[PDB]
Amino acid sequence: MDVFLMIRRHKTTIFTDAKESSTVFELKRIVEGILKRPPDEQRLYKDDQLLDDGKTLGECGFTSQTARPQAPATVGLAFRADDTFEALCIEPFSSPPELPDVMKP
Amino acid sequence: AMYVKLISSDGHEFIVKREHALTSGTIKAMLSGTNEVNFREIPSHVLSKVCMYFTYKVRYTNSSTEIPEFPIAPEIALELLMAANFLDC
Amino acid sequence: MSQSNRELVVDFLSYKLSQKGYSWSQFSDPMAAVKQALREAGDEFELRYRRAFSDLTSQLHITPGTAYQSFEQVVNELFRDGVNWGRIVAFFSFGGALCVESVDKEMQVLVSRIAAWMATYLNDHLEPWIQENGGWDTFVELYG
Amino acid sequence: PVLRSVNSREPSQVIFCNRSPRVVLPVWLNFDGEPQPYPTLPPGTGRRIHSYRGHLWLFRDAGTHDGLLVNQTELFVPSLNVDGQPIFANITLPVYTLKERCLQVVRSLVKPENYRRLDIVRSLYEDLEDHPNVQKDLERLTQERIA
């Protein structure tokens, strides 16, 4: 069963899919192919929870009812930097303008 | 497969599959005229929703599954309408 | 006055037969205002409800032995919810269509029978309503 | 009258199945070619209905008149039942274009008197005002008889 995700770091968002039985490490391989950094230099987060490389995407909470094509689940990404790691930082999207009057009830 | 980078007007980089981005005829023309497209007047909160529509159309087109609704909040509907008219999708 | 209704039946059947090329004389044998009014009304009904003619043509296995059974079923369902002027001209248009098709299928023996079926039903089950609604003069005013 | 039900009088058990989030209005094209509305189907519900072989059915959003699909196509023609089991007419959402979906959401929030008070290109006023209806869809389906 497929789950649809948004891998997000800083001002970068990756739209990808994976099997629900796919593991977090395998998802790191997908990130490695795109952003050219290996899994050992990655930390994937669901909200603010660190995900083990051994758990499947379903065991982390990414099911077909939470990771849908029209509403993908968000996975955080942090890269290794020198002897330490950088903190998780996802810069938010822009904000929509105030709802115009003709659209209000 | 191959990926392309769609850059919003506020600097957000969206990395989608090239097949999915080619849903828009405008993006297919911008790419064919290298693997990046800069949208000078599409904000990130709109371009993100457009990318979600690409992964939504490719999954459910020609599929016999029960298709769910593509949701559009009222605060984004007017800008998403303008973006879709420009991108032709 | 009873057989003044018979005159209408014969007049309307002669009219629809002469539209197809057949004479009433080959098969048997103001008042002119109601005949002309019922003549024009049957033609207008025939134009407005052409599908009813097509649907009935394709549903009635018409046969001299079973023609009366088919006539009574059609007429009884035609007046199921009561009678009105429009249905009465449909009753006339049905008998006209029944006659013209009987000549087309070379069952001309039914042309006289149909006229008696119509005259009988018209006297038994329709004349009470007609006189209660102002007679045929009311029909002519409503049509003009 | 090109698109009309055939008066076959041959019964055909059909199950209208609403596999969409919309309140579905089944539309029957009569023998005269006109569309007639039938009782609506809430989302997820389904009724076993009596129709006839050769009849034509369309399915619409009962409120916005958005076009829906039946068995992946636009029209439904019931057939004779094999083995006494009914024919399923599965009504689903089509994958709308983003533009049309956006037009749908805006149409449901702005009264038609206020379409012009929105700040968009004038071509989007005419697009917002061209509501989906059954009549325009029929004229397209009739003119697609060519080959």
Author numbering:
A (entry chain B): 1 to 105
B (entry chain C): 16 to 48, 57 to 112
C (entry chain D): 1 to 29, 82 to 196
D (entry chain A): 61 to 207
Quote the study on this structure:
Hence, it was surprising to observe that, the relative orientation of BCL-xL in BCL-xL753b was drastically different as compared to BCL-2 in BCL-2753b, despite being co-crystalized with the same PROTAC molecule harboring the same POI ligand i.e. ABT263 (left). Superposition of the VHL subunits from the BCL-xL753b and BCL-2753b structures reveals that BCL-xL and BCL-2 are rotated nearly 180° relative to each other along with a ~14 Å translation due to the altered path of the PROTAC. Unlike the BCL-2753b complex, BCL-xL does not interact with the VHL ligand. Moreover, the majority of PPIs and protein-753b linker interactions were mediated by electrostatic interactions of residues residing on the α3 helix of BCL-xL, centered on one end of the 753b linker. The oxygen of amide moiety of the linker (closer to ABT263 ligand) is positioned such that it makes an extensive network of hydrogen bonds with D107 (BCL-xL), R69 (VHL) and N67 (VHL). As a result, this network is further extended as D107 (BCL-xL) simultaneously contacts both R103 (BCL-xL) and N67 (VHL). R103 (BCL-xL) also acts as a bridge by contacting both D107 (BCL-xL) and D92 (VHL). Additionally, the interface appears to be stabilized by R69 (VHL), which makes multiple hydrogen bonds with carboxamide of Q111 (BCL-xL) and hydroxyl of S110 (BCL-xL). For BCL-xL, there was distinct reorientation of R103 and S110 in order to generate neo interactions with VHL and stabilize the complex. Although the loss of polyubiquitination was not significant for S110A and Q111A BCL-xL mutants (lane 3 and 4), there was a significant loss of activity for D107A (lane 6), consistent with D107 being a central residue at the ternary complex interface where it coordinates multiple interactions between BCL-xL, VHL and the linker moiety.
